Ligand binder design. Structure first.
Ligand code: ADP
Ligand code: A1BKY
Ligand code: CL
Ligand code: CL
Ligand code: MG
Length: 860
């Protein structure tokens, strides 16, 4: 039914007077109430379109240049020091370290036994003679940790240390950091000397000479605006993962290596068909790397049920079982849901592994942290799996690096190490005690569908290549056992390979990177990829960027697009942050934005929020206000020094690591807006109240509606909400807006904007913030139609509201867009806006108020 909006007569008129002063078109009302007219003003201001394939330039290392900071070395000995001097000094330093440090000699002795060591000479010849090589070999040979070292030490030992600066790309944040720490440790160092790392919002720079930067590809791409300056070698690691940014970088690097053949590219791959990569890079050589494998006995779901005598409480391949297996096996398998992972069978399998009386670690492949937590809980219930007999360790990207390194530690005699792992343990790391693999046969992939703005953290079937790779992890120390939890018939219906990310990932961020780097057309450049993305993804990226006014009608980068290109967040949040700067609430909007890059700081364990966490929300029915209020309290507690911070965080059940990384990310976002010319004064920390009148916070909530659009919903009763699609959905358990018990919430408005629309067995809105009907019209709606008493918003909900208010508010939206265009041309103008534009912003400030829509959040 149409929702009744109670806005005052004075507000009606003030809106009309601002639209008067903007000399703007109040789209008049229809004659026939069944001829509904579109209120949506077209664009009221544009960027002067520009005229319409570039190569990223390359230059080699040189002694007076810091390639990591992209700046001349002017202070210190290294400003004038000769390459010969630098090389002699680094060589002398290294030989002396090696002859003095006994713990270091011992570590080198371990290095010299890695399978890859035998191929050191062959690898180094191939690189010295070819612009591009591929190093191919089984996971655990030592490609990742040793090859960057082999190259550096080659230069150091041959008196040319100064001529060597290596970029190593990794498809994951966790790999870039872990490998940097591991390689530093192998060289008797911490990151910051010969090794360093750069990931989104965190870096430890290496020394400028004879050094290795481990990064994520996203970092190297954002740093390319000035070219690859002072680097001898780009090692692209784990190319077989088909991480989308790695696929993208291979396009860039192939044009680099064609134009600048003195550069060295080294691609490194697990044992897959690398023909594609070889052919792509002008039939470059492939260096085979190998060492001792062992046979691994493979079993499937039928073999597992039979040999454990286990009994449980697309077509279904658990009803298919051959006649060489007994009837209780078939009857038991046929009771298992293929969409579930049988946690109880995994327990039974661990117990069967005991009876073999061959000691070794068990690696369990589980798709996400949810099934690792679920497995871990289930085990730590049964006292059989206590400290006396078992060390059960989780391995996922989000647990702290102290805990992640424990998977490599050895375990007391008579205790069995069990690793409950994501696919990090498939090809990117090697745990050395492993004799037994239990394989869920599933992957976790983020699927996004634009048409309905639906996110699905999907549990999908692994590939045969994934099952073969997972089986290989059992056969590094002795003959091993791999227990696949899929039926033999399910295995026959598995794809050979996962879909590459390039085929199933939104491309608007890569599109911005192509345009910032002057590489040509989005379509044109992506057509040269090794396996190009689907057309509809390209069209969808171009549509997103034009709608944001990041591209002009000639598909060229606007001054707005150039700032969004530089901000390492979702473009829509980038634009939200520019709007925050204009309203002088930049700090708060940079915090909302930074927080989307990290897990929730609330340690809530998948249950409904308790009293302490709900309290951070005040009277705003907003997960985002809760998050801003946590940061304000945390930042106050931190005045008391580290231990006061630790105590505040564990007394409030907060993840301190997440609050610190989010804070660092906010500081970096603010720096980029500063260097784009936004004044310091629009980005200051602003104390606020989450209970009393606060116009700064009202504007932040208006801008959050813009940021998360089109995620709007309407509350019916209890946890039931109506989505943009006219569809029924649930309030996420996580939300301060989820009813703790049977007490139903009394929302002063039924409208919510939210961070994520999530598909599981149902549709969920996670990260929910109540907005007024005025904020809906202003920033949480594209198309609005009026019959003259009733408005239809994006074809999914109706408001009973003045035709004049609705059209006046839609015009404010259009007026606000035009100012954003003008502000991005010259950001310092926000200091000194002409009066009509201040009145426009004051009107948005006013209709952001709860009072503006007849709401008082202090009276329930
Ligand atoms: N943090 C660590 N602790 C212990 N061993 C490690 C660690 N990191 C790597 N290794 C060991 O180094 C060896 C080489 O690993 P890596 O270079 O990743 O191989 P590849 O890249 O060829 O798969 C393996 O035996 C692995 O177990
Ligand atoms: C473009 S290139 O390939 O020639 N070099 C290159 C390659 C890669 Br991967 C990363 C980086 N730099 C960084 O990641 C960072 C630099 C800083 C910084 C700190 C203080 C002052 C100035 C810069 C912080 S992170 C550089
Ligand atoms: Cl191996
Ligand atoms: Cl493929
Ligand atoms: Mg590797």
């Amino acid at each position: 039914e149409p929702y009744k909006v109670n806005l005052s007569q004075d507000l009606e008129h003030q809106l009309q007077n601002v639209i008067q002063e903007l000399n703007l078109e109040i789209v008049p009302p229809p004659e026939d109430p069944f001829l509904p007219v579109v209120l949506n003003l077209g664009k009221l201001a544009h960027f002067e379109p520009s005229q319409r394939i570039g190569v990223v330039p390359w230059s080699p290392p040189q002694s007076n240049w810091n390639p990591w900071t992209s700046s001349n070395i002017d202070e210190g000995p290294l400003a004038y020091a000769t390459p010969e001097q630098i090389s002699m000094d680094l060589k002398n330093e290294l030989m002396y370290q090696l002859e003095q440090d006994h713990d270091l000699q011992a570590i080198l002795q371990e290095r010299e036994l890695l399978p890859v060591k035998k191929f050191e000479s062959e690898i180094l010849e191939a690189i010295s003679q070819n612009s591009v090589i591929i190093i191919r070999g089984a996971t655990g040979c030592g490609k990742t940790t040793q090859v960057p070292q082999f190259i550096l030490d080659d230069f150091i030992q041959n008196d040319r240390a100064a001529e060597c600066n290596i970029v190593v790309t990794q498809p994951r944040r966790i790999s870039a950091v872990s490998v940097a720490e591991r390689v530093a440790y192998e060289r008797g160092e911490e990151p910051g000397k010969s090794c360093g790392y750069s990931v989104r919002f965190e870096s430890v720079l290496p020394r400028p000479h004879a050094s290795i930067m481990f990064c994520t590809v996203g970092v190297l791409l954002r740093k390319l605006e000035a070219g690859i300056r002072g680097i001898s070698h780009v090692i692209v690691d784990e190319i077989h993962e088909r991480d989308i940014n790695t696929d993208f970088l291979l396009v860039v690097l192939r044009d680099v290596v064609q134009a600048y053949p003195e550069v060295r590219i080294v691609l490194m791959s697990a044992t897959i068909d690398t023909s594609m990569f070889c052919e792509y890079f002008f039939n470059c050589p492939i260096i085979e790397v190998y060492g001792r494998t062992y046979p691994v006995q493979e079993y499937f779901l039928e073999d597992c049920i039979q040999m454990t005598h286990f009994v449980p409480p697309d077509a279904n391949c658990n009803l298919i079982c051959g006649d060489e297996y007994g009837p209780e096996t078939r009857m038991s398998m046929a009771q298992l849901n293929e969409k579930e992972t049988p946690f109880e069978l995994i327990e039974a399998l661990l117990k069967y592994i005991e009876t073999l009386n061959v000691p070794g670690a068990v690696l369990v492949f589980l798709p996400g942290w949810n099934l690792i937590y679920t497995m871990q809980k289930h085990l730590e219930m049964n006292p059989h799996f206590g400290s006396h007999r078992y060390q059960i360790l989780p391995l996922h990207s989000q647990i702290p690096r102290e805990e992640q390194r424990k998977v490599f530690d050895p375990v007391p005699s008579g205790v069995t190490k069990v690793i409950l792992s994501t696919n990090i343990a498939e090809t990117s790391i090697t745990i050395n005690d492993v004799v037994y693999v239990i394989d869920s046969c599933k992957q976790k992939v983020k699927l996004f569908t634009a048409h309905n703005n639906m996110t699905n953290y999907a549990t999908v079937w692994a590939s045969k290549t994934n099952l073969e790779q997972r089986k290989g992890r059992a056969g590094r120390v002795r003959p091993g056992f791999c227990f696949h939890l899929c039926s033999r018939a399910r295995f026959e219906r598995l794809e050979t390979h996962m879909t590459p990310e390039m085929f199933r990932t939104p491309l608007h961020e890569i599109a911005l990177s192509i345009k910032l780097l002057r590489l040509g057309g989005i379509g044109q450049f992506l057509a040269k990829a090794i396996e190009p993305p689907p057309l509809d993804a390209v069209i969808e990226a171009e549509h997103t960027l034009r709608e944001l006014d990041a591209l002009d009608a000639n598909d060229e980068l606007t001054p707005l697009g150039r700032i969004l290109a530089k901000l390492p967040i979702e473009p829509r949040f980038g634009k939200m942050m520019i709007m925050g700067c204009i309203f002088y609430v930049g700090d708060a909007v940079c915090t909302i934005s930074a927080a989307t890059c990290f897990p929730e700081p609330f340690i809530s364990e998948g249950k409904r929020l308790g009293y302490v966490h709900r309290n951070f929300a005040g009277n705003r029915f907003s997960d985002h206000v809760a998050l801003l209020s946590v940061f304000q309290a945390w930042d106050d507690a931190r005045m008391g020094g580290e231990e006061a911070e630790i105590r505040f965080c564990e007394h409030k059940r907060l993840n301190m690591a997440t609050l610190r990384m989010t804070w660092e990310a906010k500081v970096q976002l603010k720096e980029i807006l500063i260097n784009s010319g936004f004044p310091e004064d629009c980005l200051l920390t602003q104390v606020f109240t989450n209970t009393g009148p606060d116009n700064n916070l009202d504007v932040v909530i208006s801008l959050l509606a813009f940021g998360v659009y089109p995620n709007v919903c309407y509350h019916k009763e209890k946890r039931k909400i109506l989505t943009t699609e006219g569809r029924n959905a649930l309030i996420h358990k996580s939300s301060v807006n989820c009813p703790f018990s049977s007490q139903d919430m009394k929302y002063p408005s039924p409208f919510f904007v939210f961070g994520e629309k999530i598909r599981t067995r149902a549709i969920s809105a996670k990260g929910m913030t109540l907005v007024t009907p005025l904020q809906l019209l202003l920033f949480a709606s594209k198309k609005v139609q009026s019959d003259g008493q009733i408005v239809l918003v994006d074809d999914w909900i109706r408001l009973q509201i003045s035709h004049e208010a609705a059209a006046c508010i839609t015009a404010l939206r259009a007026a606000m867009e035009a100012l954003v265009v003008e502000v991005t041309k010259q950001p310092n103008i926000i200091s000194q806006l002409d009066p009509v534009n201040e009145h426009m912003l004051n009107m948005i400030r006013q209709i952001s108020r709860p009072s503006a829509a007849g709401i008082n959040l202090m009276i329930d």
